[PDB]
Design a protein around this ligand. Structure first.
Ligand SMILES: [Cl-]
Ligand SMILES: [Cl-]
Ligand SMILES: [Cl-]
Ligand SMILES: [Cl-]
Lengths: 234, 236
DNA sequence: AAAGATATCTT
DNA sequence: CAAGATATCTT
């Protein structure tokens, strides 16, 4: 399928190549940074060719946001079926158990057209391509010195998983109100060992999660949410 | 001076090299993206070797943060002058059409500017200068495939070096992340330093007492004129 | 954990 | 403009 082919392609590309620098049209290479702000950017760009390739094999058009405040990184859809779009979002985190910030819980999930390339209800799947790298110069290089360029990571792993499956019940951020993923080992993300019973539960939980502890002290975790449901959503 | 040599070097490198892709150890090239998140990251990496070169030439050591939530991008200091550190911060913004007005988010106004050791590599009072290396690019299929040893994700790029206080404005650059906003002006105004504050001291006092929301600012000061009125009256 | 920093953009 | 979105980290 598109899904199986995409993750097979991502795995192989991750196994075969090591990004190590920024190259200019003149052939001068600048080494990379060892922080997430740098790597998250690189990992997405590294995934782009692969995503377009596989999508094309399966007859899907690939669209990227035209706005910088828009989710997702990639929108896939067949021109015949515009209402069955697939959102593919790249997320990154580091290790020296991990966790990811899975996007806002007050934007598109609460307003059908807020900060999203296409209305939320036009997407039938929301995939996360997660990159996990094990954390590790100030000079430039030429094409013959690629082997000398320090790689900003000791290792990198990649997985493709549905957003709802790896979602947790604790916010991933405060002021930027992000859904927090489960806090687990890489294996749990690949295997989809989450806490939500269904995507319906995931969505409802995050659509009704209060922004601060004061207000939440309703529900602060999955157990309290299930109780809130029993009480009649009050 | 370190400053004159640094801008000349940055300005020159900008003119002689065009960043165009991510290269792998195997020689495979991945095209760049055209958004600010990508380019701001690139422009900093592009600036790094130049900053280090010029700094070393003037006997300055360069130190980058050991963690993501610390300002500045680069801390320069001579061993002999530990309390005369120079913060150099890389900032980027874009323009749809070249020569349009631009604005930058000049860092938070509730971290190190209000607390000497909060979110900063070294205590704020050990720095005597806060420079901003500003990059402005005009925003701009081949970009979708990989290449061997490529369209550029920008039409043109301009760079300037200026003191933070000099290009500071009186309206916030961000809401929930409480950033100082720069003046909203053309590139040349940043180069020439046509800001609104009269001194670095006025800049600091203004941003140290700027309230977080329009509501609060409504009864104190929301702009420079109001701040000067607030000051005239006795800070009340 | 919960809240707010790390940079910049959009309506 | 304001305010809160776009990502992740720190504590
Ligand atoms: Cl993106
Ligand atoms: Cl992303
Ligand atoms: Cl940096
Ligand atoms: Cl920066």
């Amino acid at each position: 399928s598109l899904r199986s082919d995409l993750i097979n392609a991502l795995y192989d590309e991750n196994q075969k190549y090591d990004v190590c620098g920024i190259i200019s049209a003149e052939g001068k290479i600048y080494p990379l940074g060892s922080d997430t702000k740098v790597l998250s950017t690189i990992f997405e760009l590294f995934s782009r060719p692969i995503i377009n390739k596989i999508a094309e094999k399966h007859g899907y058009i690939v669209e990227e946001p035209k706005q910088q405040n828009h989710y997702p990184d990639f929108t896939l859809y067949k021109p015949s079926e515009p209402n069955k779009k697939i959102a593919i979002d790249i997320k990154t985190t580091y290790t020296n158990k991990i966790k990811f910030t899975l996007g806002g819980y007050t934007s598109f999930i609460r307003n059908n057209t807020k900060n999203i390339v296409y209305p939320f209800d036009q997407y039938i799947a929301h995939w996360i391509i997660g990159y996990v790298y094990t954390r590790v110069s100030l000079k430039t290089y030429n094409i013959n010195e690629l082997n000398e360029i320090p790689k900003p990571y000791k290792g990198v792993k990649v997985f493709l998983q549905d957003k709802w499956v790896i979602a947790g019940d604790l916010a991933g951020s405060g002021n930027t109100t992000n859904i927090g993923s489960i806090h687990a080992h890489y294996k749990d993300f690949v295997e989809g060992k989450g806490i939500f019973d269904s995507e319906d539960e995931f969505l409802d939980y995050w659509r009704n999660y209060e922004r601060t502890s004061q207000l939440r002290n309703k529900y602060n975790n999955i157990s309290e949410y299930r109780n809130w449901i029993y009480r009649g959503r009050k």
